[PDB]
Ligand binder design. Sequence first.
Ligand SMILES: Nc1ncnc2c1ncn2[C@@H]1O[C@H](COP(=O)(O)OP(=O)(O)OP(=O)(O)O)[C@@H](O)[C@H]1O
Ligand SMILES: [Ca+2]
Lengths: 576, 358
Amino acid sequence: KPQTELPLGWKGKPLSGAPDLEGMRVAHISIIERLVAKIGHLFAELEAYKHIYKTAGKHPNLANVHGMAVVPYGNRYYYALLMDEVDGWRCSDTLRSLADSWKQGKINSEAYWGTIKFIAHRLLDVTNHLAKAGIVHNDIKPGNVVFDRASGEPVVIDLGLHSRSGEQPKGFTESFKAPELGVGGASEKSDVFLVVSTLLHGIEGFEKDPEIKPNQGLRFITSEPAHVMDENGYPIHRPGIAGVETAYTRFITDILGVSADSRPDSNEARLHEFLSDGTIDEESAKQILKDTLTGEMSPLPTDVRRITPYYLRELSDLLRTHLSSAATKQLDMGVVLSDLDTMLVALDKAEREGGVDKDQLKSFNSLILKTYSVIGAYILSIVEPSLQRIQKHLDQTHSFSDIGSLMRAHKHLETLLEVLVTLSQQGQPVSSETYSFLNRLAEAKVTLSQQLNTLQQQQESAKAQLSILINRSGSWADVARQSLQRFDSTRPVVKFGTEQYTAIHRQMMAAHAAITLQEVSEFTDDMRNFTADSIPLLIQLGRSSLMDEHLVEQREKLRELTTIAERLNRLEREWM
Amino acid sequence: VAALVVDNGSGMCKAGFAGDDAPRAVFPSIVGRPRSYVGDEAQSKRGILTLKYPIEHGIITNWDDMEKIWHHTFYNELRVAPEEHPVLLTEAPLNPKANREKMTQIMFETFNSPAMHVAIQAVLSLYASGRTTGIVLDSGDGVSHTVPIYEGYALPHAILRLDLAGRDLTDYLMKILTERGYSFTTTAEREIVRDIKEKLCYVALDFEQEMATAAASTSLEKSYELPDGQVIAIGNERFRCPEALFQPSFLGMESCGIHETVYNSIMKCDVDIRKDLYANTVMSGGTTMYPGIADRMQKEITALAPSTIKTKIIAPPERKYSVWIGGSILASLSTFQQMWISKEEYDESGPGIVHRKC
Ligand SMILES: Nc1ncnc2c1ncn2[C@@H]1O[C@H](COP(=O)(O)OP(=O)(O)OP(=O)(O)O)[C@@H](O)[C@H]1O
Ligand SMILES: [Ca+2]
């Protein structure tokens, strides 16, 4: 008999309403035919539920526990906490899918934030409910929150680290915990912290940036872009970064950024500006969650992480272990070629995007070359995806940004080819499959060189037109720069309020803009024609890093000239 | 005595006296119940209220709340006595007859108006253009309409409704501003975003070209100062937001843009009158107030229409009040005082009279 046909039994006296165990069978936590069993601290957890149930009562957003049972598991029999199954998704999966549908326009902004504030009101109602029984949860996080598909309701499902009010917590999650939690006891105001940091996790998308922790709240970048740009000019939200102080940021600040004493409790937090203003009907919110949970789940994003100095060092550490293993003759030849392929993908991503210094890039690139040398001195199914990835890179539209990428890809295919035929020298001979693979590599190398020659020819052409364009600017560049700087010194900005209230302020700008436009009145046609040529060229040159650093410096020279010229071309329409 | 002109919309209510250039009272169509206030005060006291919109997509859905707005309009905004002034109300195209009778009943049995009349909103906008023939693009806060009108008669079979308007655009601007680290969520902040939309947005004549300009440099970026003093800066969101009017896919909708909706309305009319519609395309509503929308509208329709067709777009300087202005004009005519539904007529016929007189 497998354990799927072994019966279950009770340990103590089950709670009122508990089901009959006679017909139940088995398919951490296991599923029972729907019920759920959680396999010392377990018995204290059941007692916590019972205390809550008799002091505060049962709760729709709290787990429904039936009692302690003995279940067949792992060639043994275990004590198991029996509870109703919350059929749906976990908090991380739900909030990711919710935000995803929002961005795709499946729901509008009032539906998204309304649902968010609905979820907040429920969680804070739970922490308020536990506070009635004098019980602190101490471990509220996306893993311990499950949404029910049928009702669209958030349900917290764990009490294993609970404690009474004023005593030390049984445990905590270091990534979400309050500053005072676990030091020096626990409190309701520590649970409120957890609720917010949990929400902050799923709103900002902290799962795409492992270098930051939800309990650190929000960073404020106000004098600089609080965002990053993509390929086509669309701003992209940075997890944990805020560009302006709003009700949302105040909510985080007034809770995650204050001491326990100054921190609001569950009822106070629900009266906050963020949770008071901008809410929707509960059933509308519940309906949105239903539709989300009955739809397609947004998967955990893989390889979405930005290449930072920290992460680049991590990738560097991975390569050095291969170097070390090679010195001790235990080098894994298979995983070192596949790891190197992720390095190139990481390096390409780091080039087109920003952040990491170029000194660290050349250093990281040298480390890759070093690993190649060690591999070479050390002397198919694994290198196959590497060729497929590169071949798809060859069938795309290329830019000047891709030249450094195509060079390294060529080096990789060249190294793969060398490795294969070198192993045939004093090892297994070249097979019919390896042979056909060698020529597929060889064909890609040819295409790689043909395409790389074209790009550099086009680059030299673009570099020629670039210098020609900079030359024309010499007659108006510095004069127009001084004028626009004098104008920008007046701090031009559109003000809030009625036209009456902003009348004097607006006509002051029109006067300033007029003066500036009179000082450059003799270059107004040159600057108009200048941007007609420079903008399409700036598009061709891009914003990514290029090998020719002189070209990069000149490209930014043009970008600054273009910025001056195009703004003056639009200055009348903007402020007059 | 001066007749009253009241224009009830999804987001804003316009009221005043017939014979004036602009409505003297313009306030949000919001009613706030406990857990009662109307308009601005309802917004200022939102902390103890639940705000609702009586009008949805140009159609009244909450008659109890609609009464409070009219009561607020009369005794608080206009500060007049409804029983001493005839009243001209407005209605959306294809407004259900049950709504028309209910509207009639309220003005007579609740506010005791001496006389009333209700007119189609788009038709009043055409009158304010000095036209009896043409197609109107009416676009407000909740609904957009294309209404072909010939010799004073609206053509019901060619009228198209498009659930795409101002509050959708404001909502859209709220989402795409988060990508810049700006998180506006509350109703108060929604109004601020609406303010940003009305001051920094514009319609690009060539969308893909402007996107290239926005990506290449910082030339298109403009700064805005929040009421608390905070300064934000936005870029391509300026023209990406009203672009949704032409590309509803930006809003998750699989429907035609305003330019293609106008074309489809014209193409449902008789062949021999399409020329007159093309030459007299009138724009109405606050949503049509974006800088550059007329030129873009001209461009897009020209691409759809046959080559021989002449395309002319009329866009009045304050077409946010065109409906009201058209109403003020109509109620000022003494040739029109023949059309009012008198209190006597109502007591004789009942609510069902509105189908015969209006
Ligand atoms: N200058 C402007 N630029 C852009 N949008 C504007 C401008 N002025 C007003 N609006 C928008 O117009 C909308 C309201 O206009 P209007 O009063 O014509 O429509 P409404 O009657 O309230 O709505 P509906 O016609 O759907 O009933 C608001 O959403 C507002 O954001
Ligand atoms: Ca309207």
